[PDB]
């Protein structure tokens, strides 16, 4: 959301000004595979009130992502944009897709892809045999121990 | 251009008003009688029944109520629902209506051409049917699709089945809070001053507002309601009359949406029923005049003896 919020407002254009209608579309794909840091999948809760008495609903982050795949990302951006009346206008330019299923119309409008903010660590099975042999063996286990 | 309002009878001469009525009347009979061969006009393929399949309902007219007695001596009240003119109008593909089940459109009883919109009349002209009064949307699985223009009869429901009823209830206008919600009223004689049917306190002092769910006087009655778990006792063939247990919503001579019951207990109770609908031509046999449930005391049956 941090880099997506900047693009929507236009804070990357040196011609930026709040009165001007400068603004750029942002297309975010693979929003079902977001990785919440720490235990925020079970601790962070999104709450809303329907207005009617007894209509206070609190939903865990895991539950909300299981029902609406794009709700987690949309709410994060929806709270980081400026709280003026332009927030509704600039949210319409944000396109979210749960997976890599984008209509051909949207694909033809793209220009460049922003780099990923977090470097994805690789699992053990993704390391090549050259890397495994390159890393030294720290210790020598005894031969008589049963693993 | 301030064009003046006009109606069909404005410019018709006295010698042509009967002629126009005859002209439209003859077209209706020719069009209706030309649809009486659903299986002889290249119908869509018919698939065998499968678990979890849904059938097509009807649009019927509520006549009235009759008492009915069962073989155990108990008394039941049945509502006479008559199917006057029922035809499937249009078919919507699965992915264009809901994404899970296809939609089949069913019309109501015949009405006059002279009091419908241009688009509505044009739509029926392409199909070749007289205009209908009420049009409802039915959710039907892909294995029970019916070619549009296929007539439907009251034999579509066999006695012993449980059906639902959806229709607009009796509108009682702008009714007070006592009638609408059932709030108790204030006493009538122990000094009460200009307060006998008012709701009273409507909120609390602290909140300083009225909650959205608060009950207040307003419109009552003219809304869509559904009745579930109504058993079918008797089916009449020549008059196309359906008997349903209990009371159905809606006033007399109204149009009622009838469908198979969606309650969990009454699931998959359509294997022993016509699928996708009753075709009189295919059977090539005459059904009984009246179809009775096994627990119904027929009018031409011997008197009940508890010996």
């Amino acid at each position: 959301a941090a880099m997506a919020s900047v693009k929507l407002q236009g804070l990357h254009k040196p011609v930026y000004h709040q009165l001007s209608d400068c603004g750029d579309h942002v297309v975010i794909m693979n929003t079902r595979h977001i990785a919440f840091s720490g235990n925020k999948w079970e601790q962070k809760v999104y709450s809303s009130h329907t207005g009617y008495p007894g209509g206070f609903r609190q939903v865990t982050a895991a539950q909300l992502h299981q029902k609406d795949p794009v709700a987690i990302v949309k709410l994060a951006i929806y709270g980081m944009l400026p709280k003026n009346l332009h927030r509704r206008t600039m949210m319409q330019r944000l396109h979210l897709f749960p997976d890599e299923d984008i209509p051909e119309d949207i694909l033809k409008n793209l220009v460049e892809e922003l780099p990923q903010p977090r470097k994805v660590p690789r699992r053990l099975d993704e390391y090549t045999q050259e890397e495994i042999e390159a890393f030294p063996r720290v210790w020598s286990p005894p031969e008589d121990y049963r693993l | 251009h301030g064009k003046s309002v006009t109606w069909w009878d404005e410019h018709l001469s006295e010698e042509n008003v009967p002629f126009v009525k005859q002209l439209v009347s003859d077209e209706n009979k020719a069009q209706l009688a030309s649809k009486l061969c659903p299986l002889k006009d290249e119908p869509w393929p018919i698939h065998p029944w499968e678990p979890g399949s849904s059938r097509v309902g009807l649009i019927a007219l509520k006549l009235g109520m009759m008492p009915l007695w069962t073989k155990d001596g108990q008394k039941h009240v049945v509502t006479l629902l008559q199917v006057q003119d029922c035809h499937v109008l249009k078919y919507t593909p699965k992915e264009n209506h809901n994404g899970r089940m296809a939609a089949l459109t069913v019309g109501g009883k015949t009405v006059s051409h002279f009091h419908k919109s241009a688009s509505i009349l044009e739509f029926y002209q392409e199909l070749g049917l007289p205009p209908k009064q009420k049009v409802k949307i039915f959710n039907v699985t892909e294995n029970a699709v019916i070619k549009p223009g296929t007539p439907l009869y009251a034999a579509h429901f066999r006695p012993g089945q449980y059906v639902d009823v959806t229709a607009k209830t009796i509108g009682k206008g702008f009714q007070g809070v006592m009638r609408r919600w059932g709030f108790k009223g204030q006493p009538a004689t122990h000094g009460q001053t200009k307060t006998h049917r008012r709701p009273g306190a409507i909120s609390t002092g602290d909140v300083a507002r009225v909650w959205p769910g608060t009950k207040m006087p307003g419109q009552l009655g003219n809304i869509d309601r559904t009745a579930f778990g109504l058993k079918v006792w008797r089916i009449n063939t020549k008059h196309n009359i359906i008997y349903v247990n209990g009371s159905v919503p809606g006033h007399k001579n109204c149009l009622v949406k009838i469908k198979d019951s969606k309650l969990p207990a009454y699931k998959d109770f359509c294997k022993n029923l016509p699928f996708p609908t009753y075709f009189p031509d295919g059977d090539e046999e005459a059904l009984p005049e009246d179809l009775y449930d096994e627990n119904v005391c027929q009018p031409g049956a011997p008197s009940i003896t508890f010996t």
């Binding site: 254009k13 694909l107 033809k108 793209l110 220009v111 460049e112 | -």
Partner: protein, 150 residues
């Protein structure tokens, strides 16, 4: 306030001062009195400074019309057609000289709020910023997720 009055951009009339400088003041007309005590400042200015002022500024025409009046006035007209009324009622000799000298240095445009303290024509030297002025070009101009034709 700014929202109450009009505004104009910093503009020089007839591109003055680019090729040559032309004194935009055109004429002055003094309406003083020979007997009113309030016209003493005007009378002293005419006797002493008017003759010397005309020599320094040969491009202006000075009219003196001593007539019965109560409030002495000086009217200055400029080339662009703007006429500015002024009052020299009961002012000292040196105050008149400062006021007249100020009228000689004004370009004649309306005295309202100036939106910007600068004016320029064709300021986009070596190019102006557009969202494509700093983005590298991809081989073949391919979109981020575009499949190659072959």
């Amino acid at each position: 306030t700014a929202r109450g009055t009009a505004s104009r951009f910093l503009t020089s009339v007839l591109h003055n001062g680019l090729g040559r400088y032309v004194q935009q003041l055109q004429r002055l007309s003094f309406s003083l009195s020979r007997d009113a005590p309030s016209s003493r400042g005007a009378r002293e200015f005419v006797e002493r400074e008017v003759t010397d002022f005309a020599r320094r500024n040969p491009g202006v025409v000075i009219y003196v019309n001593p007539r019965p009046c109560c409030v002495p006035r000086v009217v200055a007209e400029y080339l662009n057609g703007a006429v500015r009324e002024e009052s020299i009622h009961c002012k000292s000799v040196e105050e008149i000289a400062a006021l007249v000298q100020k009228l000689a240095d004004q370009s004649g445009l309306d005295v309202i709020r100036i939106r910007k303290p600068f004016h320029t024509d064709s300021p986009s030297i070596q190019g102006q910023w557009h969202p494509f002025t700093n983005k590298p070009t991809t081989l073949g101009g391919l979109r981020p997720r575009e499949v190659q034709d072959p």
